[PDB]
């Protein structure tokens, strides 16, 4: 694990190049001049629940855009068919890997947010919350099926495995 | 300027060319949510939020700026406290707790009036830790002091 971490650091140090000069970039300053967006101040856990329910609503809209009735997405982001499929229904269920990749990213985000929701209800201790957040970022590959969707993501897991050992 | 939280709470609670284009930037909102996760010594954290008129998307709109020696010192304090806690005390949390068929929990009815528990803090003896005693566990420490930080 020492040799692999030092290998990735040598690769990041060797492939370093200065970024290209450009005009300075501000997305939300362009969003603010649009009258369709407003601003407020909220708590972190409230917006963390709003983000995951909005992601559920977005994936549900992307399912029900193509008039699909035989698929079901759980609130914890698991997609399952309701019946045994046919030839044409599998042709009408051809989404990209980006769909399931964003699905697993929202699944990871919902795990991370609900770990705090379980804490602020008084159920677990902060000493146990710090363990729980440490298990998630170490075991993304075991808690999610996101490794099947991007293969280069195998680099990201083993590094989190290697930092798992040393510490 | 800003807007009170009850409006956007009602927006998210009760709820198409204008609606469809706003969902393009959803993993950007995921990134802005994940880079601002609160530290183990904080209990709550208030962040600004941009939101659509119909509740399409919600961003966090803040970069997590810390002072580096304060940050390393706070994590070393957490390191010592967690070593002390494991040599003293263990139930790992049961993963995903909320089941597949139930919706995510409403904030306004279940967390909004419930006071949180105690965080992870070191003791900080008032004789030796006197230069750091008044600001060591704030969100952005010394933000409103003109002598140490340049401004807001």
């Amino acid at each position: 694990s020492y040799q692999k971490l030092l290998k990735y650091y040598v690769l990041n140090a060797l492939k370093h190049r200065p970024p290209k000069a450009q005009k300075k970039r501000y997305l939300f300053r362009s969003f603010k001049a649009t009258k369709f967006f407003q601003s407020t101040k909220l708590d972190w856990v409230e917006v963390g629940l709003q983000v995951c329910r909005q992601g559920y609503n977005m994936l549900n809209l992307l399912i029900h855009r193509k008039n699909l009735n035989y698929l079901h997405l759980d609130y914890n982001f698991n997609l399952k068919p309701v019946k045994t499929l046919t030839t044409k229904e599998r042709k009408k269920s051809r989404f990209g890997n980006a769909f399931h990749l964003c699905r697993e990213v929202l699944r990871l985000t919902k795990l991370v947010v609900d770990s705090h929701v379980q804490y602020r209800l008084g159920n677990v201790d902060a000493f146990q919350l710090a363990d729980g957040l440490q298990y998630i970022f170490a075991h993304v590959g075991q808690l999610t099926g996101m490794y099947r969707y991007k293969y280069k993501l195998m680099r990201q897991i083993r590094m989190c495995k290697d930092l798992k050992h040393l510490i | 300027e800003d807007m009170p939280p009850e409006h956007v709470r009602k927006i998210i609670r009760d709820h198409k060319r204008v609606y469809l284009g706003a969902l393009k930037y959803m993993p950007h909102a995921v990134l802005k949510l994940l880079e601002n996760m609160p530290m183990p010594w904080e209990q709550i954290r208030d962040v600004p939020v941009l939101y659509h008129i119909t509740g399409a998307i919600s961003f966090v709109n803040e970069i997590p700026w810390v002072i580096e020696p304060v940050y390393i010192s706070q994590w070393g304090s957490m390191w010592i406290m967690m070593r002390r806690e494991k040599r003293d005390r263990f139930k790992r949390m049961r993963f995903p707790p909320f089941d597949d068929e139930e919706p995510p929990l409403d904030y306004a009815d279940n967390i909004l009036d419930v006071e949180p528990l105690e965080a992870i803090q070191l003791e900080l003896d008032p004789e030796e830790d006197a230069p750091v005693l008044d600001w060591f566990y704030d969100h952005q420490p010394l933000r409103d002091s003109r002598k140490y930080v340049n401004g807001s």
Binding site: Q22, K23, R25, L27, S30, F31, T34, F36 | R17, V18, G21
Partner: peptide, 23 residues
């Protein structure tokens, strides 16, 4: 019609960051 023009103007503003260099 106006809302798509607003999103197209914001996309053209995003493309303005590299507009004279890319084309």
């Amino acid at each position: 019609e106006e809302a798509d023009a607003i999103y197209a103007a914001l996309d053209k503003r995003m493309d303005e960051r590299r507009k004279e260099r890319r084309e």
